């Protein structure tokens, strides 16, 4: 939440947890979410491919 983590980064961590279940851009696309969201946040979170 907002307990030390900034709102933007809070959104990012929620994405990172999604990343652990294996969310890729195609999965986001299946949910109507833009592929750019997975890719860009992936870069920001420094996640390994």
């Amino acid at each position: 939440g907002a307990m030390g983590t900034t709102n933007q980064k809070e959104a990012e961590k929620a994405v990172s947890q999604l990343f652990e279940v294996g969310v890729r851009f195609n999965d986001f696309i299946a949910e109507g979410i833009e592929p750019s969201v997975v890719h860009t946040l992936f870069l920001k979170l420094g996640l390994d491919s």
Partner: protein, 44 residues
């Protein structure tokens, strides 16, 4: 300097709805067990 962008609400709506579905664990693409449940909830 990317501490709270313009992106934040846009990110939240898409992320929150996605995460909330997984929070119920009925996510069409992702079935989540125990360890995943704790990872989502404790981290964010």
């Amino acid at each position: 300097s990317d501490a709270v962008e313009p992106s934040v609400e846009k990110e939240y709506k898409k992320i929150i709805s996605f995460r909330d579905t997984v929070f119920e664990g009925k996510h069409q693409q992702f079935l989540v067990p125990n360890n995943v449940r704790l990872k989502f909830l404790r981290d964010r």
